[PDB]
């Protein structure tokens, strides 16, 4: 919240008008009127290609093949325009343009007067428009041009060209994966997809108040922090403008601080009692406070501007191993107020593909989250930067945030000109997010000399977050008991995630009645054209194979053979997953001390896919969220593979000590292999008994009451590959998922 | 010197017109002119709290808290102006106006159109204005804004907020103290604070002449020298114009180089013999040699140009120690002309709070330097840039230089716009300085990424003087016997100070009538509310304690009580820094070889303030000064502490053997504890002996007498706390130090 003068929004109606890019691209008013070009009629916050299904001018690129059927729009225009009432400004006040995003290029008029121009999809855009402004009817016009086009105005160095990202995206600043990806569809898009708003300052404002936690002590709930704040003030108003510094939770006020103003910067350094520090889930309360700085005048009364955030009193430390592989990727554990938690949780694609929807769906995807207990969560840099809802949602709900700096796999430029766009880039995400006590980590997501990464975003970091972590960078997909698999050394695993077939429901409303059974011909294990282009085919080119033949391959080492029936298949490639994910878990889980994390891909498709993640676009989970949930409890009892049969083990990601009892019995017949009671510590794997070997295959069940609750979970023994029918009964008769 | 065609100063009266800086900054004549503001007469060098002064707008800053009523003008803007004659400039010959230093932001106008815009007031402004003057009278305008308001044109990072320095100084070059210290006032001002002068240049010009001492050997009175000569040269000139290279020492020419002009860029390597090499204060004479290099037509004996300065023949080395505390701060040794040196001097600070009349102050605070028998001084970087008075005088007298850039305690901008500006401060600076000899070593006075010290600054010593030192860096007050200080472990400490009570004709100048006593109502420890403002209390907060209880609590620790008569205050406070500061430099050099430095806090005040300087800024000497004197000899007799007694020694800092008879007997009894004849070995501390221990406490006198001369020291045996009329009439009757 910060309480400005006035906030005027700018969202609804626009019109709008498109047309080809010619040779030389539009960028003024009179070429845009003049230009041969479709008008309709327009929605802000929005993508362009809503605004055309809603006039009717494209079919729905959710289903089948229609996703190609936008390609002649990546080189067309986009040409935004309404008018508004001009605010009130009195004298000495300033009125603001905001964007929240522009995607991309533009130049943005008001009253036939250029006033700025974007060239960044993934960050805010401001503009002083108080000169130009005149009274009545205002006009704003904001004329975008093609972003694939933009990329031929630079010349691209060798390891630019030729990787998993596009060409296009190297020189520009857009979400990677708006070109296409594996798990993205390419739909580039265009359009004002965040906030426009009107906003109107007093001559006294708050520039920035950066909260910052110096230490915290949980158990004499106690901390130290510091505010640094920066404010636009007029030398008439110093010694008579004081600082209103009030720490509340549920109302209740924990601290008041005024000071007199005598310097437009400041450091205030609050010492906190009775207040409980932030932790992440599992390991404590997610303790938010309300912290509001006002700037008021000391003789009037009057308040000039008010900031208002929820923060977090915690501390955050990288600590990297470097005695077990020094340097590696992966050998480091996060230290959360002085105590090393393990990390669980998702990597975050896009929420949409069209990103102007993505706050619609926030809410409802962090609460998967909540359902699964992840205590972290990876923003994948092939995303847009996420906004601040979502990361008030993390601070709410104690998920911890490791934020990667928006590039995609490929290398980029060394010259001046895109390192300066990367440093404005950086700086403006930094302040933006900076003050969120679910952030943890900055990411540069990356040979060790590549400016971008090693100098660019580490300046930035050493500038404006030093409290918080920098790090420069982070058989296969055959049998999930593959040594690949089982002998990875990385003590943090960051993406890991095995393909799964949507729920039948999904599948119906994706593909054409004729293209929902997946066999082209009634041949199994080939793909029909609309099943290829949802394994997400950047580009219609007619082949056979490729990466839908990951759920065959899989299904028949699992289960020897593919199922020609489609519900069949759905349930064994579902099994597939379910079995794989819930394995890394309790592989990761079942070797700690030395594992410290994993970070699995993923929670939620972007788009509707076929992919490796545990729920689809509409909603649909499937069998490996059930799976998934089980095995991240807070305290949870499992089984790994042993030397000579099975260690039952019990993990705890809190802080407690849990006292329990837990049995284990065989499925198929019913004899109980163990049952006992046993002791977790807090903050460790503790080892309960090593189980016998069994013999042939079959399906183990795991029943744990912890203070009062029942628990379940289960252990698949035996070498594949497994009869599909005999693999549901043991499910069914196990009585914890449905089929 | 610098022979111009011709120079005419524009020093003198200026009409000064000030008004309230309004939102948008004036910039323009028109504007300037427009606004309603006051008009008074100036003097230019000036500052602007001295002209209006002069007109009786504003009380004398420097007395009780007049300081504080100087607060509004801080948001004002200073429009100079005035009308000069044009010289006379030939076809070809260049017109330069030069400013000596603007303070600060300044827009330039000569006869209504813009020659320049300063924006730093700690270098030169030279302007080409050949083309905008006109025959007869001309018009120069400045318009000065105000330099607190330009900060908020800047966005500071985390870590340049909430240092000592002030905020509004991070992001603009000015001289940090003069928003505030803990011995300095807030005095920003404003103002011509240097030289305002008219510059003829004749087509052959010499642009830069850097002279550069590549060997010397003292001892066969050789050298050899560099010329760095770089020039304007027509090309019609080329081969038609020889330099005449001149070195001479009291009119006696030591060598005449002519050489034939062919390119604009020369070195000339002159190998001198019958030439004496440059030292510091003991280790030899501080030999200068006028050096002349001129620009002479080869046909017609025209002189185009000529430049001269008096330059020394030395090699400085500076030799890091990493075998002790490998790069530990104050871990090394100066090596001057291959000789390791023992450095002994004072920390300079800004000679005034209005800095125009730091040029007025230059002779007596040096010759301070030149009684004590200093051989260092470390510029702080806290204060401007001395001019090049200020060097001669150390080039003269045998006083190396330390400089500091002038950056105060906290960290700056890692961005592009900071980093130029300092490098085209640090272009300038060096290559205006880089010619004394007197001058040793640059630093960065600021972890080890830090841009601007790191990276900045070292790249410009890099390529604009390669032979000089770059250095990116440099119970507590207690008794000064502390272990904080008697086991410090740097071998070179650079800040070390104790507070001591001005003389009372200081007190009674400073304060008003009923505010010279110290306490408030009577109450001794208790300061009112002008000594809490003398103590230098940056802004108006009205508050018990703090600085000033430093002066009180070493009284207690030494004599046990705070006398309450003013008289006996000062002397006891006197003599605690007295006491204080000898110790320490006694410390220092008597145990050398290990120990390489000190270099002590501070020998005189820039205002009238109580502050740990020795000496006040009217000139008064405090205690210390003499105390200081008598420890600072080129060969000194003095006690350590030993472990069962104390240890006679004799420290020598000069490349000569001395001999001499000391002897050593208590003061209160009479009774001779050692007299005998020592052996002063150059260059090192020599052990005389070691005394019984005395008994309780008491005083012993050291007389020494070396070559006809006699010297005398005292040492201060027993523990605190002492009778201070004890102390007095130990002091009184051993004769040295007046009471």
Redesign the interface.
């Given at each position: 919240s910060h309480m400005f003068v006035s906030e005027q929004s700018l969202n609804g109606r626009w019109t709008l008008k498109f047309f080809p890019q010619p040779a030389v691209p539009v960028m003024t008013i009179e070429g845009a009127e003049a230009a041969n070009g479709i008008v309709v009629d327009a929605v802000v916050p929005g993508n362009v290609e809503i605004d055309m299904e809603a006039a009717g001018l494209v079919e729905d690129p959710m289903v089948g093949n229609n996703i190609y059927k936008l390609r002649p729009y990546e080189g067309y225009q986009w040409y935004y325009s309404r008018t508004f009432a001009a605010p009130v400004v009195t004298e000495?006040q300033r009125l603001v343009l905001h964007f929240g995003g522009i995607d991309t290029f533009a130049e943005v008029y008001v009253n036939g007067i250029k006033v700025g121009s974007a060239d960044n999809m993934l960050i805010e855009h401001d503009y002083d428009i108080t000169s130009v402004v005149k009274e009545g009817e205002n006009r704003l016009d904001v004329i975008i041009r093609s972003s694939v086009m933009e990329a031929q105005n630079h010349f691209l160095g060798t390891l630019s060209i030729g990787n998993f990202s596009n060409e296009e995206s190297a020189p520009v600043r857009r979400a990677p994966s708006t070109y296409g990806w594996d798990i993205m569809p390419r739909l580039v898009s265009a359009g004002l997809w965040r906030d426009v708003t009107l906003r109107v300052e007093n001559?006294v404002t708050i520039?920035?108040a950066?909260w910052?936690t110096l230490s915290v002590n949980p158990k004499a709930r106690e901390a130290s922090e510091?505010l640094?704040?920066?404010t636009?003030?007029?030398?008439?108003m110093?010694?008579k403008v004081k600082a209103v510094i009030t720490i509340s939770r549920d109302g209740r006020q924990i601290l008041r601080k005024e000071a007199l103003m005598?310097?437009?910067?400041?450091?205030f350094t609050l010492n906190l009692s009775g207040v409980d520090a932030w932790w992440p889930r599992g390991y404590g309360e997610p303790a938010l406070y309300t912290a509001e700085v006002s700037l008021v005048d000391v003789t009037s009364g009057k308040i000039y501007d008010t900031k208002t955030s929820k923060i977090g009193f915690r501390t955050v430390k990288l600590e990297l191993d470097e005695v077990n592989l020094p340097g590696q990727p992966g050998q480091f554990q996060f230290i959360i107020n002085g105590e090393p938690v393990f990390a669980k949780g998702t990597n975050w694609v896009p929420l949409d593909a069209l990103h102007s929807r993505d706050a619609s769906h926030v809410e409802e995807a962090v609460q998967l989250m909540v359902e699964m207990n992840c205590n972290i969560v990876r923003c994948w840099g092939g995303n847009v930067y996420e906004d601040t809802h979502f990361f008030e949602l993390c601070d709410k709900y104690g998920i911890m945030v490791w934020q990667d700096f928006a590039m995609g796999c490929g290398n980029y430029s060394q010259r001046d000109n895109f390192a300066?766009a990367l440093?404005k880039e950086a700086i403006s995400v930094v302040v933006k997010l900076r003050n969120h006590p679910s952030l943890i980590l900055w990411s540069g997501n990356n040979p060790n000399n590549d400016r971008v990464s090693r100098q660019v975003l580490s300046?930035v970091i050493?500038?404006?977050?030093?409290?918080r972590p920098y790090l420069p960078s982070s058989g296969p997909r055959g049998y999930y008991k593959d040594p690949f698999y089982t002998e990875n050394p990385s003590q943090f695993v960051s993406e890991i995630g095995y393909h799964g077939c949507p729920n039948r429901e999904t599948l119906e409303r994706m593909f054409s009645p004729d293209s929902v059974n997946p066999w082209q011909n009634g041949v199994v294990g080939m793909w029909n054209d609309e099943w290829q282009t949802k394994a997400n085919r950047i580009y219609d080119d007619k082949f056979q194979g490729g990466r839908n033949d990951l759920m065959t391959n899989q299904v028949r080492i699992i289960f020897g053979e593919v199922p020609a029936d489609l519900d069949d298949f759905i349930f064994a490639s579902q099994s597939v997953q379910a079995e794989a994910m819930k394995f890394f878990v309790e592989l990761w889980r079942g070797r700690r001390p030395y594992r410290t994390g994993i970070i699995w891909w993923n929670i939620r498709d972007g788009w509707p896919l076929l992919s490796d993640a545990i729920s689809d676009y509409w909603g649909g989970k499937k069998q490996a969220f059930y799976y998934m949930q089980n095995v991240h409890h807070d305290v949870c009892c499992l089984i790994n593979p042993a030397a000579n049969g099975y260690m039952l083990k019990v993990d705890n990601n809190t802080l407690k000590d849990f006292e329990g009892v837990v049995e284990v019995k065989d499925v198929a017949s019913g004899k109980q292999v163990f049952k006992g009671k046993f002791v977790s510590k807090a903050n460790q794997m503790s080892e309960i008994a090593t189980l016998p070997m069994q013999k042939g295959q079959g399906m183990l069940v795991i029943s744990y009451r912890i203070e009062g609750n029942e628990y379940f979970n289960h252990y698949l023994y035996g070498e594949p590959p497994y009869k599909l029918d005999q693999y549901r009964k043991w499910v069914k008769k196990c009585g914890i998922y449905e089929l």
């Open positions: 000495g001559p520039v920035d950066n910052v510091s640094y704040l920066q636009r003030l007029p030398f008439e110093h010694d005598r310097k437009f910067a400041n450091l300066a440093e300046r050493y500038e404006f977050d030093p409290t």
